[PDB]
C-alpha cells in the first residue's frame, strides 16, 4: 500500500494440496504443466 498499480487481476483456482507451490515463477509441475503458468516476473502474490 504505497504505490498505485493501475490494473490487478482476480485470478484463482484450487490445488492438489500437495503442490501448494506450483504457483511460483517457473517452478514446475502439473499446473505449470498442462493446467496453468506463472510469468517469470509475476509482480503478485499467491495469497492462498
Amino acid at each position: 500500500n504505497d504505490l498505485c498499480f493501475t490494473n490487478v487481476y482476480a485470478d484463482s483456482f484450487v490445488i492438489r494440496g500437495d503442490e501448494v507451490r506450483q504457483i511460483a515463477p517457473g517452478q514446475t509441475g502439473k499446473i505449470a504443466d498442462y493446467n496453468y503458468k506463472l510469468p517469470d516476473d509475476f509482480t503478485g502474490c499467491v495469497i492462498a
Partner: protein, 48 residues
Amino acid sequence: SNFGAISSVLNDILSRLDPPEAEVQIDRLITGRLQSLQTYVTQQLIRA
C-alpha cells in the same frame, strides 16, 4: 572456464536446469566472458 557455474557450455546448462534459475549460471558466464573481453581490449589499446 565456467566462472563458477556448473559448466562452460551453454547447450549443457539449458538441458539440465530450469529457466527460473538458469539465468544465474548464464549471467555468471556472461560476466566472466565480458571481463575477459575488457581485459583484451584494454591491453590492445595500451600496446597500440
